[PDB]
Design an enzyme around this catalytic site. Structure first.
Site, PDB file in Angstrom:
ATOM      1  N   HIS A  43     -19.354 -43.759  11.870  1.00  0.00           N
ATOM      2  CA  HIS A  43     -17.932 -44.018  11.804  1.00  0.00           C
ATOM      3  C   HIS A  43     -17.637 -45.289  12.596  1.00  0.00           C
ATOM      4  O   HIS A  43     -17.392 -46.345  12.003  1.00  0.00           O
ATOM      5  CB  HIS A  43     -17.184 -42.795  12.322  1.00  0.00           C
ATOM      6  CG  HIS A  43     -15.712 -42.900  12.170  1.00  0.00           C
ATOM      7  ND1 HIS A  43     -14.848 -42.020  12.780  1.00  0.00           N
ATOM      8  CD2 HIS A  43     -14.949 -43.775  11.479  1.00  0.00           C
ATOM      9  CE1 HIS A  43     -13.607 -42.357  12.477  1.00  0.00           C
ATOM     10  NE2 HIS A  43     -13.639 -43.418  11.693  1.00  0.00           N
ATOM     11  N   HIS A  96     -15.414 -49.347  11.519  1.00  0.00           N
ATOM     12  CA  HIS A  96     -14.537 -50.073  12.440  1.00  0.00           C
ATOM     13  C   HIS A  96     -15.157 -51.334  12.996  1.00  0.00           C
ATOM     14  O   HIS A  96     -14.609 -52.431  12.815  1.00  0.00           O
ATOM     15  CB  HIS A  96     -14.140 -49.156  13.606  1.00  0.00           C
ATOM     16  CG  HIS A  96     -13.239 -48.037  13.185  1.00  0.00           C
ATOM     17  ND1 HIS A  96     -11.868 -48.088  13.344  1.00  0.00           N
ATOM     18  CD2 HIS A  96     -13.513 -46.855  12.590  1.00  0.00           C
ATOM     19  CE1 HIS A  96     -11.336 -46.958  12.872  1.00  0.00           C
ATOM     20  NE2 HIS A  96     -12.313 -46.188  12.425  1.00  0.00           N
ATOM     21  N   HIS A 125     -15.546 -45.507   4.800  1.00  0.00           N
ATOM     22  CA  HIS A 125     -14.738 -45.085   5.908  1.00  0.00           C
ATOM     23  C   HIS A 125     -14.003 -43.788   5.540  1.00  0.00           C
ATOM     24  O   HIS A 125     -13.968 -42.876   6.345  1.00  0.00           O
ATOM     25  CB  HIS A 125     -13.707 -46.173   6.286  1.00  0.00           C
ATOM     26  CG  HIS A 125     -12.788 -45.709   7.381  1.00  0.00           C
ATOM     27  ND1 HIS A 125     -11.492 -45.291   7.144  1.00  0.00           N
ATOM     28  CD2 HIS A 125     -13.013 -45.541   8.702  1.00  0.00           C
ATOM     29  CE1 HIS A 125     -10.955 -44.887   8.285  1.00  0.00           C
ATOM     30  NE2 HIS A 125     -11.864 -45.003   9.243  1.00  0.00           N
ATOM     31  N   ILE A 174      -7.218 -46.218  10.296  1.00  0.00           N
ATOM     32  CA  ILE A 174      -7.108 -45.201  11.360  1.00  0.00           C
ATOM     33  C   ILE A 174      -8.511 -44.777  11.785  1.00  0.00           C
ATOM     34  O   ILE A 174      -8.651 -44.259  12.900  1.00  0.00           O
ATOM     35  CB  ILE A 174      -6.300 -43.948  10.882  1.00  0.00           C
ATOM     36  CG1 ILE A 174      -5.923 -43.043  12.093  1.00  0.00           C
ATOM     37  CG2 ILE A 174      -7.096 -43.201   9.795  1.00  0.00           C
ATOM     38  CD1 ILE A 174      -5.168 -43.774  13.201  1.00  0.00           C
ATOM     39  N   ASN A 232     -14.355 -40.417   7.689  1.00  0.00           N
ATOM     40  CA  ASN A 232     -13.185 -40.298   8.553  1.00  0.00           C
ATOM     41  C   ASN A 232     -12.331 -39.064   8.264  1.00  0.00           C
ATOM     42  O   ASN A 232     -11.963 -38.324   9.229  1.00  0.00           O
ATOM     43  CB  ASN A 232     -12.274 -41.505   8.394  1.00  0.00           C
ATOM     44  CG  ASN A 232     -11.068 -41.432   9.341  1.00  0.00           C
ATOM     45  OD1 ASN A 232     -11.205 -41.742  10.487  1.00  0.00           O
ATOM     46  ND2 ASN A 232      -9.908 -41.001   8.849  1.00  0.00           N
TER      47      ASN A 232
HETATM   48 FE    FE Z   1     -11.649 -44.368  11.326  1.00  0.00          FE
END
Ligand code: FE
Length: 823
Positions: free
Chosen positions: A483, A488, A674, A823, A678
C-alpha cells in the site's frame, strides 16, 4: 472601440472561499491573450484589463457553491483568437476560479485553481484554453508563455514553501524524524543513499532541525502546491484531514481513557472485540465529547452522545462472525483479501532462503513433505501440476526479526506459509514455518518451528496462533509495501515531474493528472501524522520505529515495469505468459479474484491509453522529439526515483510502445492497484483477530502458565498475542477513514469537467473507456453471482469480491476504483 466592433461575451465561474457584489467594481481583472497574433517579440498580444461586470443569475446549470459573472472584452484590430488569459485578484481573500467561457464558436478555459491576492504572486496567474498541444504544435504566440509557466512551477529549489505557492520539486524523506523532541525520535533519512534508497517526495523547504542539519524541522502545515489541496464542499469529504485529527486529538483522548482505567486495558474474549460494533464501547464523557464535533471523525462511530462509541460492523463478519477463523478464509484472503498480491508459486521443495547462514543460522526449511496434506497428491505431483504456492515472508522479515524482538511488546517470527491449490480450485494452508534467527551470540532460547493444521486440543490453538503470526507479517508488508511504498510513495515522483515538465496544454498532462488527484495531499498529511516518528503507523504496527525503513529495504527490489499487472503475476509464479488467451496470461489459480478482475480493468485502461496516445503521436520519432516529455521522463527517473536511476529496466521512452507502457502502468498503480489494496482495509481488518497488526509474544513453552492458557482459554491466548486493545481502537479508526469513499470522489472513467479538452476524438475515446468500465462491472457482478466461484469470490465469510468494481456510492462500500491515490 471600433464603431462596428463587437465585444467578446465572457462568463467567469468562481467559488468564494467561504456577498457576491464584492467581486464587482475593480475587484477582479482578466486580460485575454491571443493564441494567433503576436507582438514584435513573438508573444501573443494581450487585451485590456477587464473587470467583472455583474452577477449572472440566469444559468441554471451551476454546481453547488458556484457563482457566475458577466464580462465583455474589447477585441478590435488584428487580435486573432484568444488562447489564454491573465487574471489578477485585487481582493484580500483568495477565491477558487472554476472556468472562463467565451461565446461567439465557444472557447472554454477549465481553471479549477485558487487565485490569491495579486501582490502575493511573482508572476501573474495565466490560464490556457482547453486546447491540447504537444510542444511542436504549440501556437507560436503561446510558446514562450507555455515555457515560462513551467519555469514558474519548477521554482529554483530554494525557499520555504508557502500556502499559495504552486512550486513542484523533490526532496528526500528527511522530515519523519523528530530529533529536536527526542533523540529516540531520530529516524534515518530515506532516499539519497545506497543504504536507504527511496522515492522522493514533494519539497517543502522548512529548513533543518536545530539538532540535525539533515532532518527537516517540524511544521504545523506540511505544504503541498496549492491546487494539490483543492478543498471540499462538505467537511465530511475531507477524509485526509481525519488522519491528522486522529493522531493529534482522538488518540490522546483514547489514551487518557486507558490511563484513567475507565475501560479494561485488554480484550478478554473475542466477544469483547465483537462488542465494538454491537453494543459499542463505553468511554468517559470527555472522550465522546472530544470526538463528536470533529468533521470526518464524527462519521466513524455511532454514538448516544454520552458514553457510547460504536464502530460499523465490518464486512468480514456480516454473515458469519466465526468464518474468519477457518483455514479456508485464511488462504482465500491471500487471493481476494486486503493484500492479494504477495502469494507466489512454489516450484521446488523445500523452500530456500538467500540469506547468509553465518548471520542467521542454518536457513534450511524444516518443513517435511510427508507432513503435508495435499489431498492425496505427492510432492512431485503437486510441484509438477503447479498446485503448490507460498506466502513467503522469511527473507523479507528475517533481517529485521532480531531488532523487532528487542522491542518491548513486539515479538515476531519470519514466517512462510505453504498453500495447496485443491482440485476444487480453492487454496488450503498446509504448513506454517515460524522462523527466528539463531547464532552463537543469542540470549533467547526460543526456537523456530513448523506448525501444521489442527482442529482439536492445544494443537488447534497453536495453529490458530501460527496463522496470526503469518497475518501480522502480512499486515505489516501490506501496509508498508503493498500500500504505502507501491502506491502512495512510488507515485508521488511522477506527480511532481508531470507538473514540472508537462504543460497543462500537454496531452500526457491531460491523460495522467486526473490520476494524481489528492495524492500529494494525503502523502503530506501521512508524512506528518501517519509514518512520522511515533505517529499512528509506528504505534500500531509491529516494526514500530523500524517500519518506514523496512519499506526502503523493499524498495531496493522495486521494479517499475514489474508493477504492470501481467508482469507482476508472471514474476510471482501465479500466472504464465500465454498468447492464446485474451489477456495474454493464464492464471495458475483460475479463480484468483484480484488477478481475474484486475486483468479486466488493466485491459480497459490499456485500450484507453492505446487510443489516446496516437491522437498526439504519429510515430516513435514524435515521442523522441517531444522535449517536454523527454525532460519529464528523464527527471522522473533520474530525480524522482533517482536512487534507482541506473537500473537497466527503466523504459527509455523513445517509442510509442514505451509511452503507452509508462502511462498504463502509472494509471494502473494510481487507480485499480491502489483501490484493490486500500478499500478492503476496514472490510477485512475491522475485526482485529482477522488482520492483527502486531504480535507481542512468541509461542509459549510447555510447563508455563502461558502454555496452559492455550489449553484452557484459547481466545485469551490469542488476544494476548495480537495487537493490544488501545492501539486496536486507533488502528480501526484509521482504516475506517481510509476505507471510505468521499462523495466528491472522481472514479475511473470519470473526469471533473466534461471539457477537459476541446479535442472531440479524445472525448470520444474517453466515453468508450467509461462505457467499457460499465460493461466490466456487469461482468464482475455475474462472477460474484456464479455459484461455481463461491469458494474464492465469497468464501465462508460470504463476502462478494467487489473491490475492483469500477463504480461506487460514497462511503465504506468495499467497491469502486477512484482515478487516483486519493486516500
Ligand atoms: Fe491509500
Amino acid at each position: 472601440m471600433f464603431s462596428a466592433g463587437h465585444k467578446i461575451k465572457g462568463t467567469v465561474v468562481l467559488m468564494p472561499k467561504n456577498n457576491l457584489n464584492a467581486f464587482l467594481g475593480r475587484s477582479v481583472s482578466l486580460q485575454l491573450i491571443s493564441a494567433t497574433k503576436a507582438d514584435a517579440h513573438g508573444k501573443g498580444k494581450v487585451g485590456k484589463d477587464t473587470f467583472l461586470e455583474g452577477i449572472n443569475t440566469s444559468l441554471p446549470t451551476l454546481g453547488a457553491g458556484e457563482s457566475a459573472f458577466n464580462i465583455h472584452f474589447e477585441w478590435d484590430g488584428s487580435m486573432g483568437i484568444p488562447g489564454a488569459f491573465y487574471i489578477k485578484n485585487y481582493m484580500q481573500v483568495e477565491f477558487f476560479l472554476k472556468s472562463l467561457t467565451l461565446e461567439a464558436g465557444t472557447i472554454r478555459f477549465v481553471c479549477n485553481s485558487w487565485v490569491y491576492n495579486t501582490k502575493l504572486y511573482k508572476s501573474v496567474r495565466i490560464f490556457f484554453a482547453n486546447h491540447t498541444y504537444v510542444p511542436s504544435e504549440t501556437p507560436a504566440p503561446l510558446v514562450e508563455y507555455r515555457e515560462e509557466e513551467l519555469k514558474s512551477l519548477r521554482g529554483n529549489g530554494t525557499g520555504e514553501r508557502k500556502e499559495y505557492d504552486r512550486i513542484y520539486d523533490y526532496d528526500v524523506y528527511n522530515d519523519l524524524g523528530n530529533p529536536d523532541k527526542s533523540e529516540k525520535l531520530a529516524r534515518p533519512v530515506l532516499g539519497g543513499s545506497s543504504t536507504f534508497p527511496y522515492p522522493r517526495r514533494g519539497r517543502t523547504g522548512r529548513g533543518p532541525t536545530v539538532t540535525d542539519p539533515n532532518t527537516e524541522k517540524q511544521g504545523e502545515v506540511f505544504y503541498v502546491p496549492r491546487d494539490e489541496n483543492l478543498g471540499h464542499l462538505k467537511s465530511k469529504d475531507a477524509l485526509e484531514i481525519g488522519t491528522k485529527s486522529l493522531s493529534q486529538i482522538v488518540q490522546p483522548a483514547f489514551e487518557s481513557a486507558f490511563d484513567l482505567k475507565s475501560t479494561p486495558i485488554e480484550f478478554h474474549s473475542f466477544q469483547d472485540v465483537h462488542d465494538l460494533y454491537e453494543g459499542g464501547i463505553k468511554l468517559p464523557r470527555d472522550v465522546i465529547s472530544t470526538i463528536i464535533p470533529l468533521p470526518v471523525i464524527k462519521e466513524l462511530y455511532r454514538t448516544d452522545g454520552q458514553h457510547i462509541l460504536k464502530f460499523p460492523q465490518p464486512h468480514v463478519v456480516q454473515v458469519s462472525q466465526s468464518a474468519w477463523m477457518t483455514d479456508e478464509e485464511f488462504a482465500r484472503e491471500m487471493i481476494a483479501g486486503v493484500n492479494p498480491c504477495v502469494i507466489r508459486g512454489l516450484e521446488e521443495f523445500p523452500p530456500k532462503s538467500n540469506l547468509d547462514p553465518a548471520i542467521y543460522g542454518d536457513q534450511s526449511s524444516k518443513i517435511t513433505a510427508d507432513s503435508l496434506d495435499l489431498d492425496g497428491y505427492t510432492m512431485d505431483e503437486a510441484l509438477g501440476s503447479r498446485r503448490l504456492f507460498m506466502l513467503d515472508y522469511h527473507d523479507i522479515f528475517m533481517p529485521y526479526v532480531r531488532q523487532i524482538n528487542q522491542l518491548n511488546s513486539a515479538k515476531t517470527y519470519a514466517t512462510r506459509t505453504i498453500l495447496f491449490l485443491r482440485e476444487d480450485g480453492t487454496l488450503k494452508p498446509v504448513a506454517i514455518e515460524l522462523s527466528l534467527p539463531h547464532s552463537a551470540g543469542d540470549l533467547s532460547a526460543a526456537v523456530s518451528q513448523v506448525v501444521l493444521p489442527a482442529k482439536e486440543g492445544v494443537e488447534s490453538t497453536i495453529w490458530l496462533l501460527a496463522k496470526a503470526y503469518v497475518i501480522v507479517n502480512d499486515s505489516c508488508y501490506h501496509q508498508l509495501m503493498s500500500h504505502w511504498l507501491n502506491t502512495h510513495a512510488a507515485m508521488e515522483p511522477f506527480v511532481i515531474a508531470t507538473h514540472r515538465h508537462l504543460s497543462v496544454l500537454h496531452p500526457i498532462y491531460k491523460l495522467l493528472t486526473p490520476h494524481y488527484r489528492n495524492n500529494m495531499n494525503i502523502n503530506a498529511l501521512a508524512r506528518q501524522s501517519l509514518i512520522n516518528a511515533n505517529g499512528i503507523g509506528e504505534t500500531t504496527f509491529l516494526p514500530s520505529k523500524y517500519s518506514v525503513e523496512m519499506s526502503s529495504a523493499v524498495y531496493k527490489n522495486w521494479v517499475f515495469t514489474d508493477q504492470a499487472l501481467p508482469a507482476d503475476l508472471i514474476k510471482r509464479g501465479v500466472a504464465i505468459k500465454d498468447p492464446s488467451t485474451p489477456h495474454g496470461v493464464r492464471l495458475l489459480i483460475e479463480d484468483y479474484p484480484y488477478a481475474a478482475d484486475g486483468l479486466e480493468i488493466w485491459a480497459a485502461i490499456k485500450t484507453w491509453v492505446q487510443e489516446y496516445v496516437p491522437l498526439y503521436y504519429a510515430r516513435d520519432d514524435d515521442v523522441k522529439n517531444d522535449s517536454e516529455l523527454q525532460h519529464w521522463w528523464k527527471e522522473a527517473v533520474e530525480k524522482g526515483h533517482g536512487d534507482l536511476k541506473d537500473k537497466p529496466w527503466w523504459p527509455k521512452l523513445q517509442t510509442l510502445e514505451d509511452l503507452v507502457e509508462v502511462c498504463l502502468i502509472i494509471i494502473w498503480i494510481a487507480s485499480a492497484l491502489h483501490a484493490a489494496v486500500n478499500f478492503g482495509q476496514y472490510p477485512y481488518g475491522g475485526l482485529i483477530m482477522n488482520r492483527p497488526t502486531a504480535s507481542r509474544r512468541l509461542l509459549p513453552e510447555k510447563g508455563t502458565p502461558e502454555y496452559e492458557e492455550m489449553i484452557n482459554n484459547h481466545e485469551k491466548a490469542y488476544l494476548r498475542t495480537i495487537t493490544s486493545k488501545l492501539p486496536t481502537l486507533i488502528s480501526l479508526s484509521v482504516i475506517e477513514i481510509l476505507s471510505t469513499h468521499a462523495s466528491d470522489e472522481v472514479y475511473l472513467g470519470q473526469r471533473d469537467n466534461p471539457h477537459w479538452t476541446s479535442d472531440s476524438k479524445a472525448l470520444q475515446a474517453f466515453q468508450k473507456f467509461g462505457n467499457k468500465l460499465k460493461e466490466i462491472e456487469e461482468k464482475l457482478v455475474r462472477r460474484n453471482n456464479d455459484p461455481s466461484l463461491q469458494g474464492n469470490r465469497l468464501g465462508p465469510v460470504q463476502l462478494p469480491y467487489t473491490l475492483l468494481y469500477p463504480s461506487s456510492e460514497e462511503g465504506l462500500t468495499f467497491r469502486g476504483i477512484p482515478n487516483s491515490i486519493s486516500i
